[PDB]
Amino acid sequence: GSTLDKIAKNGVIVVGHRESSVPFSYYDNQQKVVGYSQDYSNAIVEAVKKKLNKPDLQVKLIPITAQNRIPLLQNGTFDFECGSTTNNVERQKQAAFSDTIFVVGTRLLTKKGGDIKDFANLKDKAVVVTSGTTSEVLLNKLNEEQKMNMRIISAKDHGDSFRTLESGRAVAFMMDDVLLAGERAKAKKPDNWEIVGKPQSQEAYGCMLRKDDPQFKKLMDDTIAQVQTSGEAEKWFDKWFKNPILVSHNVYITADKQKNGIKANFKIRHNVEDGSVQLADHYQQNTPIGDGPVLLPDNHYLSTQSVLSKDPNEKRDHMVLLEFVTAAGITLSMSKGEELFTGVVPILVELDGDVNGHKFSVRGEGEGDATNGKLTLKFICTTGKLPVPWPTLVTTLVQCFSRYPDHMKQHDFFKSAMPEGYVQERTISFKDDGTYKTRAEVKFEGDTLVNRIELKGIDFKEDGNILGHKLEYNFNNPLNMNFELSDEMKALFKEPNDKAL
Amino acid sequence: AAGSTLDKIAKNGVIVVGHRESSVPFSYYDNQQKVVGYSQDYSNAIVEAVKKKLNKPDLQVKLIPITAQNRIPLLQNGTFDFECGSTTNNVERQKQAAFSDTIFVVGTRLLTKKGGDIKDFANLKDKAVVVTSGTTSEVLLNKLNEEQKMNMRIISAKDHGDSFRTLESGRAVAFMMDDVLLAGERAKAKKPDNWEIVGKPQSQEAYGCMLRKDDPQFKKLMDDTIAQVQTSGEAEKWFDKWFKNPILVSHNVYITADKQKNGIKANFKIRHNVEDGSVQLADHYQQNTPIGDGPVLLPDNHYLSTQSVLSKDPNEKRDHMVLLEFVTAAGITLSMSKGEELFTGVVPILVELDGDVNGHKFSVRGEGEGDATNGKLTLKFICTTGKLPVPWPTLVTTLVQCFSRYPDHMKQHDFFKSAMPEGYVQERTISFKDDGTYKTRAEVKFEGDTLVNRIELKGIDFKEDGNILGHKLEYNFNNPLNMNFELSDEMKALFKEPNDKAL
């Protein structure tokens, strides 16, 4: 028998994932399960839908830990898992493993400038390790065999392990080197932590499934090997390990039929330099300027990502912005205004602002490419220096440039209101702080899409995160990994295999 | 050939409708910025009559805000087609505009503090008095100030809400306006019972729907519609809805699929009335996952429209809450699961909650029934440990969305019923503004024939003096307003013989 028969009959595949194996299988700040291994898991699921000819197969992701993964496999709580599980000979007595998706060495994470340079320095020290892992076994064996008198703290997952080290309750955290780097990227001061020591082991990550299911295993292996030899595995590596990891924002849109328009709600979480976040709650209403027909949407959402940067040639207070937005939420030309966006469209943005009496103006210029959902803009404070952080103005500074998929084009209010345009009004509520109230007209003036805004901010705290300029210069809560592509992974990509190291 | 305004509407494919911002309860923004009211019921009926007259069933509507100051110029230059709100039809304004059949009759009076000095207009000598800019009452109040040499300091406020808050904040001793609008602002006051309508009416005035002059075909459509609604009994039913019964604002529970977990997510805001007249925001974040591993319905984005009424059982001496709730799904325009079939009848419900808020432990048990065919819940909840250490309204959302009514065209989007009988796990974080948070985990599933909601609630970081632990929340839901405004003899006579006469 085979699990693929259980799955075809049930119509659902049940998939285990980890909670804190960064950046392989973990919860993003919206509780979505993401990561390098989750990308393989998504590919394997798509392969299952093809093999079984079941394009509407459902997926149920359920969380597992290093401690309970094998018991939950063995009693059928999930069908397979991909995360950070080491394939080794001992575990092959209980389970089967796919082709290898990553290779690691087990090392130490410690504060710079100590006496922890290698495993021998753990003598008489408090050392943290995650329950149920290969490192926990290795560390206890080392403690016993070399008589090192460590006080080993066994924590329930990798984030808990790391915060033991971060809080000073342990001097080092032993784990897979890549996962040490993942927990480091999430730390308050990532620059404070270094990975040290001779690897105690070399270990291969594989997907785990029940034994005696060669057909199910073969579908995994074929999928992994194809991702690896086609080069996509390396592209996924660059995404998770060499570029900023972003979390998209969801702009939730509902029709406002009585105003022939829409309303939206969404939350922005601005990174604060101390490592906290500053919530900005957005309430939005839009209504057409013209008196002719628009498209009135069913509920849906926009998935948004923005990247803020600096222009080296500009000494004025400024912001360079790239933005990528796609609509979603409905599963499977519509307006005259839609036709105005099939090419590249020039954009002009003008903002007048007053925040706690501090008056300023902003001018932005660039282009929009709605076919690809992309914006490129450069903004300048034309009145001197900006009295608020640039990130707090991003949402205020043209959702007509969203990419609507073809099956959703009847729901694109924003383009349908063009060329006469729409009024966009927001109240942005900054938690424990003040409020922005904005009113803008978004419309074509000649061949240019113009966003003309007036902003009023009141009730802000002079020492708060906004008027005190405590926000990081970024968007979408980026995480940046410090981890090089090793020779072992270069070799893996050219020769997929499923062998324990 | 349909006349100017109907020709314009057919050309545009949209009818543009002026509305007021604070004419309560005729045409005003509710607390979710929806324009609502008695006059908007007429506006909607006229829009539907226009769709029929033009044979344009897909006609769109565009409401735009107007003021007492700018309503006539904006009408004259075609910025809107008509407005129904609280505009007096008088002979002066008929030089500039046309008026429909009358929809209400008022007298201009004073609103003042109950235990104070003002009993009639003469008591206003040498005192500060507020009135709304651009209204018939402003004209009357200024004429009385000069003709009786009263030395009044007349404050001219932007709209009726601003006028009333001038009175409420003590910056004026009285507010002169149409009596029903005074009653409307009073209903929205911090302490409605502190305010009294006094004085001999300075005028009697008829409200009409405004439209452009010299457009008889459009006026006739409006008059025929108004007169039909008034003689059929429908207008009296609207009157009861706005003036005799509690006005509620529905909550919108915004739902999106969570395909990874084979479930859904939701976000919404609850606004609890505070006893001092302010509101206490409760931001809700929700995640649902099926308990079973079989197929569910994964929905497109949509929302649930919810209203609840909280009451007391006269027989019950324990700390308790009687709850009646109605929920309908919406947000998608035009049997699907086995579990849907479990809800075609009346289903008994059991609710068990184990709570801990700032270390204060309590248990709640609820029983009743759900009728998903009509989106209706009837339950009674008892605090089985004694006094409830939080206000009952803060627990309503935690204490079975499977009983929502999904319209026929939306039944493929009902995750809640599709997960049955195995059920689902429902998790929430509820964030009270400037206060603590509730974290909840519940299992909703069939146990026998009974639909059971079993909850654990953990609340932390609450202020012992705040609105929750301090028991400062009103015992209600959906921000009710109560006009308690009687149907007058003049209104009965109007509905009997509709007419368009200025008074």
Ligand SMILES: N[C@@H](CC(=O)O)C(=O)O
């Ligand atoms: N790869 C290690 C650690 C982990 O599971 O995250 C193990 O298999 O135990």
Ligand SMILES: N[C@@H](CC(=O)O)C(=O)O
């Ligand atoms: N009915 C009065 C007040 C109002 O417009 O709200 C008027 O027409 O001026």
